[PDB]
Amino acid sequence: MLLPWLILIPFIGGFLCWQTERFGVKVPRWIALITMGLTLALSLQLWLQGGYSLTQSAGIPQWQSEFDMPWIPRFGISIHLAIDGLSLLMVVLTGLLGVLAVLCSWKEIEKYQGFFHLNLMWILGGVIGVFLAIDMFLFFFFWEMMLVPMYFLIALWGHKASDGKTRITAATKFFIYTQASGLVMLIAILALVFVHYNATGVWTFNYEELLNTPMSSGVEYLLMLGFFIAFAVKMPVVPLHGWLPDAHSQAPTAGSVDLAGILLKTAAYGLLRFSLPLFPNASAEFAPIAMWLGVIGIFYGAWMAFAQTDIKRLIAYTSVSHMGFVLIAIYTGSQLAYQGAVIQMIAHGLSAAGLFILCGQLYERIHTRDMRMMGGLWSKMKWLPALSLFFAVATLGMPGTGNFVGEFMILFGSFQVVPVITVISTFGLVFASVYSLAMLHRAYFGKAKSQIASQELPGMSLRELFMILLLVVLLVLLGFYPQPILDTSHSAIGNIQQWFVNSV
Amino acid sequence: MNMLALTIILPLIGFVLLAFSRGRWSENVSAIVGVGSVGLAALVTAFIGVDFFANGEQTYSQPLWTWMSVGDFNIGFNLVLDGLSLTMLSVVTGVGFLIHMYASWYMRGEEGYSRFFAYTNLFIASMVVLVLADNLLLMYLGWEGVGLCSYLLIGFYYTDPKNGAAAMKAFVVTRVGDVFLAFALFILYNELGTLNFREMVELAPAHFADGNNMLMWATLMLLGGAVGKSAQLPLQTWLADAMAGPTPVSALIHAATMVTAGVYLIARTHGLFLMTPEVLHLVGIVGAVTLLLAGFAALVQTDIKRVLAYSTMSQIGYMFLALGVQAWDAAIFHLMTHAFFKALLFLASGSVILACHHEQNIFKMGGLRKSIPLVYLCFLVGGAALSALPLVTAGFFSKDEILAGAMANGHINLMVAGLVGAFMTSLYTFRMIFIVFHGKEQVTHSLPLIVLLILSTFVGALIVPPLQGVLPQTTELAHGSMLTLEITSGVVAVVGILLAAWLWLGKRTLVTSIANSAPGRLLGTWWYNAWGFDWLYDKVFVKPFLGIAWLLKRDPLNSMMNIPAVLSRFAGKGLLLSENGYLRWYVASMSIGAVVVLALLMVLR
Ligand SMILES: CCCCCCCCCCCCCCCCCC(=O)OC[C@H](COP(=O)(O)OCCN)OC(=O)CCCCCCCCCCCCCCCCC
Ligand SMILES: CCCCCCCCCCCCCCCCCC(=O)OC[C@H](COP(=O)(O)OCCN)OC(=O)CCCCCCCCCCCCCCCCC
Ligand SMILES: CCCCCCCCCCCCCCCCCC(=O)OC[C@H](COP(=O)(O)OCCN)OC(=O)CCCCCCCCCCCCCCCCC
Ligand SMILES: CCCCCCCCCCCCCCCCCC(=O)OC[C@H](COP(=O)(O)OCCN)OC(=O)CCCCCCCCCCCCCCCCC
Ligand SMILES: CCCCCCCCCCCCCCCCCC(=O)OC[C@H](COP(=O)(O)OCCN)OC(=O)CCCCCCCCCCCCCCCCC
Ligand SMILES: CCCCCCCCCCCCCCCCCCCC
């Protein structure tokens, strides 16, 4: 009953952000902050009232909250929302990152920031709708609707230093990748719906009804492949990753676009929620290909991150490597690896958010992103290099941060299933330590390699320090006490794992 | 005894306070916070030891919370304290406290005073977590924390890029070791369903009654992690470069915390190694080979810090030899005594560096006993304990215990390697001492030096680690056998010291003749670069990594997926040639399409 408001509060808030700009140019940021705070408060209230820790695995479907409204009854299409533990964690993370994205764009007081905040809230509402929709048409609709404000934000509000043509090219490449892969997923959805209609005789896009769809081997493989192509584009999975460092490099310099609709792992959620339960046998046969794609993603992303001279592209390739770990975890069929994947998704969201916010602040201070033009920045800044050191320590999987808990539970479950892939992935952890130390030494240690890095720089303000330290506290708490997060997602992950291994 | 978590919490609080102070506080306040956190940890450790001996050396378990709980995967945030844990905790807290007072004197007037003490406090907390953990994953938390603090402290002088390169190399090599340790953890959880040390030891012989292959793999990976942290073969290449940091960093790494973690890991999981005797023999062989190679490398080093680093590698090799011959008590005894005299030697070398200009070659200085006599005495008894001078040093008793344990179990070759290594140890130690301190001239820190001075004598050997009921007892030698073993070890050490005096005290004519000789120059170049292991790892791992990075820096997969875009551009440009604007061509294309449509309809009729 609150799930429609979880989607609608961002949309009404973005409309109010656009509408309240006539009252003043410092007004829409407050409207966006109240909007995202209300969304986060509703998500936290759903967390408190859900009783997820005491919920046991009863089998798919099992929803803690549900909402249904007819939308297109001709095709059996409904606004059908449902929340359980995994989607609840994703929605809470979306609300927190949306609050951080609003707070990070606080100083942008330009003449059209009402449209900026409207696009940000529309992206966040689309992401929440992706996490909530259990109607396949509605899920696809949210999946494709949240890319238009993404395109416009990158194209018009993006990196001001670069030429407009570069921003247009990166935005267009991202949009073509995501929307073409979404259309392939729509083809798979339509063919699954038609197979179900031929088997039974009713029109349904409901994910609960489409679970019990008898189909031959080969049809199921193709439907799985369409779903996986969409998810692999947005995860990213190599070689469908090239849009991501380009989109990150041309995103708005503060990084609200980075937090709002890139660092929320809708594709891993889609693989767990839709790909494994709808096509369990096809996913079981596809598992070696997906795991080797994850291994290639880990090492390729690590090597790409090391070779970068831009910090933003470096962090984007770190995202590629960590999503390779998550992709390995998803196809194991192990409960421990799935819980590690959930922890890894949340921790990677937090740590990459901290990294991107710190990079935006560093670019505000020194007006460049090339690491060859900096060095020795530890002696010139007050807070930024130490917090960057903490977050780089987090992305190499140091214990005490949630990233270690995530990928080590992933590797424990994966070794219980697939040992060779696991040992190669742990050498991927060595590669991760290499690229994190390389970025730290190129940016903040050594001597100044240009003139901008040789002078004292203004320190972080109270707001930026507050949000970075909140991310630090959350990452440390996830590293040392991950049990509430594991208890929240335990029932949903167990349902997905039991469905995957009991139908194969 | 209930204050076991305070030994972690107080260094953690010190690290947090000194990190968030950000250098705003004065040097006295920062020194008070850091040194007092480590000192309160040491005082709590002393009270814990008194309580431990009060109830008859009973193992004390203090759980705090459950770290992870996913089905059968249960990892607890639980501390445990037995005799081995108490010995390691006492060594870490006490020696770290002495090093902290010496660093409070030493680092005065330096940039990042509070940052240095925050990093050393985090180092102390990480090592206390490592030695107090009751399961392998919490010990892995301490393992990685110790590695990270080592990386932060080696490259402490961050403005010099070579300090940062040394810190990065140390972190990367130790992380390879940590990956091997992670393999051991994965195998042990997959087999026994637990990572608790006592539970794994209990459940191992019933589970591995049919086959022992996975247990051998797990112990081999445990040894890989151990040699990663302890700088043994084949992961030993980071220590001599880790000399780039400040002197108390080297004292903490080489005496208290870092290099003893592998010895503690092998001694703690001694039951699983006892069910895999070939892997335990490999532990002993790795220790013997590492101590021989490290002694030969230390023989030809021209720097005091490099000599001390390879001497640390040799002494850790002695402890690994003791572990491999099932002399566990001797290994822990030598760990504690080596912590004492190696901390003394490193603090003395730092006083030498502070007194005589900047860091220098050993041949540049000479005749330094007259100018700086107290640190010369510190170097003298530190080298006497390192070289196992008989009946006056604790190192003699520790090395004698190791060699007696090797002889009693029939490991004659390992005992011979230990005797040869002791001869080379006396050789390189008094070569460095006689070159540096003999020849022609060219209270905050006195108290730790005095305490480590006393503990490097037989007073250090008077302390017995309470390893009753934790580690199995070594087989006792016959009285005549250990008598001639003691005489042989003392004779070998004294002969090595006398040969070093005959070779380096006076006019080094034979030494310079050997060094300038072509086989001598070749062997000296080979041993100076630590037998070419750094060169081999640079050619085998670093160079292809950098080559693949340079080859991939253009993102070839992105271009391969950009190929359809250029195909679409080319096809559109080709198709736009038909729109030439000519009406007669448009009519001709309509008639061509009519012909094609009609022919297709007649073909498929
Ligand atoms: C897993 C593989 C199978 C499933 C794939 C699913 C589809 C989604 C994922 C793959 C998408 C690949 C898209 C590749 C092009 C990306 C867009 C792009 O590069 O746009 C920028 C470019 C203009 O920029 P610029 O280079 O400056 O050109 C100026 C020219 N004067 O723009 C242009 O030059 C115009 C681009 C037009 C559109 C690109 C062509 C699309 C063709 C169909 C794509 C569907 C998949 C086909 C098979 C892919 C390979 C197997
Ligand atoms: C360029 C990007 C887009 C890619 C190109 C567009 C999609 C191409 C899809 C090719 C599909 C080839 C199918 C070949 C067999 C057709 C004849 C046949 O065997 O029909 C059987 C069955 C109808 O008989 P029925 O009684 O329903 O049988 C029960 C079996 N379920 O038939 C059925 O039940 C229907 C079977 C449908 C199979 C799925 C089709 C779509 C799958 C998702 C997209 C394709 C895969 C991902 C993209 C690939 C890379 C681009
Ligand atoms: C402008 C130029 C550039 C742009 C355009 C580029 C080209 C666009 C079009 C690309 C896609 C081409 C068509 C791909 C689908 C082919 C489907 C097919 O051949 O199906 C045959 C068969 C159908 O199943 P059937 O045997 O009828 O089942 C009943 C029996 N149990 O199928 C089977 O029996 C099972 C077959 C499984 C595999 C079929 C799909 C292969 C896809 C290859 C690429 C993806 C590989 C995996 C993922 C890698 C990572 C993304
Ligand atoms: C369980 C026992 C231990 C077991 C092993 C644990 C190992 C993993 C630990 C993970 C934590 C990160 C470790 C590395 C952090 C490095 C931070 C750093 O360098 O801080 C020093 C810096 C002050 O240095 P300085 O140069 O004087 O000042 C800068 C400019 N003036 O400091 C600053 O500038 C200010 C502080 C910056 C951030 C400090 C670290 C933040 C994370 C730890 C505290 C989190 C908050 C505490 C509460 C958590 C939730 C309960
Ligand atoms: C018999 C074998 C037994 C096992 C042996 C294991 C050996 C492990 C590797 C030892 C060597 C590690 C050296 C690390 C040096 C780091 C410091 C350094 O040199 O940094 C330079 C560079 C910094 O990067 P940047 O800032 O871009 O450059 C500035 C200009 N210098 O940074 C770099 O150049 C970074 C280079 C990173 C190279 C990483 C290689 C990792 C390889 C792991 C292999 C594991 C194998 C396990 C066993 C397999 C058996 C089949
Ligand atoms: C979605 C964002 C998640 C951020 C990380 C949160 C990690 C869990 C933190 C829970 C609180 C830990 C400290 C208090 C423990 C209280 C224990 C009560 C029962 C004894």
Side-chain angles (χ1 to χ4, degrees), chain A residues 173 177 238-243 245-246 296 299-300 302-304 306-308 313 317 335-336 339 376-379 381-383 389 393 396-400 404-405 408-409 411-413 415-417 422-424 426-427 429-434 437-438 440-441 444-447 469 478-483 486-487 490, chain B residues 12 19-20 22 24 65-71 73 75 77 111 115 119 137 140-142 144-148 151-152 155 158-161 163-169 171-172 175-180 182-183 185-191 195 214 544-550 552-558 560-562:
Chain A
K173 175 185 190 167
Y177 261 86
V238 287
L240 317 169
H241 77 285
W243 64 273
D246 289 338
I296 292 164
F299 284 93
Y300 192 84
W303 254 308
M304 290 309 314
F306 181 77
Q308 284 329 288
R313 309 183 59 86
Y317 284 125
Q335 165 111 33
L336 178 53
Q339 291 271 77
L377 286 181
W378 191 280
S379 39
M381 326 201 45
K382 306 191 136 23
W383 286 90
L389 162 60
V393 154
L396 58 94
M398 170 82 18
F404 160 77
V405 178
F408 250 69
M409 285 168 42
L411 291 175
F412 266 114
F415 193 84
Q416 288 213 292
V417 177
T422 308
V423 304
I424 301 162
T426 329
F427 288 117
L429 303 185
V430 157
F431 275 48
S433 98
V434 164
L437 292 207
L440 286 175
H441 280 230
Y444 311 106
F445 300 141
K447 242 87 82 174
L469 282 176
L478 188 54
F480 278 99
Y481 205 58
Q483 205 46 58
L486 294 166
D487 287 337
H490 166 253
Chain B
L12 267 198
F20 276 98
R22 314 199 296 109
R24 290 178 276 242
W65 64 87
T66 296
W67 199 7
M68 284 141 216
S69 179
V70 183
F73 187 77
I75 308 298
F77 224 106
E111 183 274 323
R115 174 176 42 109
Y119 286 172
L137 201 45
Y140 200 90
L141 155 73
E144 310 308 285
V146 144
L148 172 62
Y151 151 77
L152 287 171
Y158 57 91
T159 68
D160 204 346
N163 303 152
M168 283 192 43
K169 189 229 266 210
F171 193 75
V172 162
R175 273 285 269 205
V176 173
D178 307 342
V179 152
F180 292 145
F183 294 160
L185 260 73
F186 303 153
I187 295 164
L188 281 169
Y189 171 67
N190 187 47
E191 295 303 316
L195 290 181
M214 282 341 271
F545 182 86
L546 295 178
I548 290 171
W550 175 88
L552 286 189
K553 76 165 171 332
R554 276 310 108 82
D555 207 338
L557 301 182
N558 183 40
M560 179 213 51
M561 290 304 305
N562 261 354

Side-chain angles (χ1 to χ4, degrees), chain A residues 216-219 221-222 225 228-229 240 286 289 293, chain B residues 564 567-568:
Chain A
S216 81
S217 279
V219 171
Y221 205 92
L222 284 162
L225 269 191
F228 184 79
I229 272 158
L240 317 169
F286 193 65
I289 303 174
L293 282 166
Chain B
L567 274 186
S568 296

Side-chain angles (χ1 to χ4, degrees), chain A residues 301-355:
Chain A
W303 254 308
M304 290 309 314
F306 181 77
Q308 284 329 288
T309 67
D310 192 352
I311 312 199
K312 270 251 200 153
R313 309 183 59 86
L314 195 145
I315 305 155
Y317 284 125
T318 68
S319 313
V320 173
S321 319
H322 301 118
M323 278 321 105
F325 276 103
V326 179
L327 180 72
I328 286 173
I330 278 164
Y331 282 84
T332 52
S334 163
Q335 165 111 33
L336 178 53
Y338 288 1
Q339 291 271 77
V342 170
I343 298 288
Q344 186 47 241
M345 280 147 75
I346 288 147
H348 183 263
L350 300 180
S351 77
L355 269 192

Side-chain angles (χ1 to χ4, degrees), chain A residues 168-192:
Chain A
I168 298 314
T169 308
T172 321
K173 175 185 190 167
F174 145 79
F175 202 89
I176 284 170
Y177 261 86
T178 43
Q179 269 260 350
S181 51
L183 273 186
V184 175
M185 167 165 84
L186 177 68
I187 291 313
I189 285 164
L190 274 169
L192 172 68

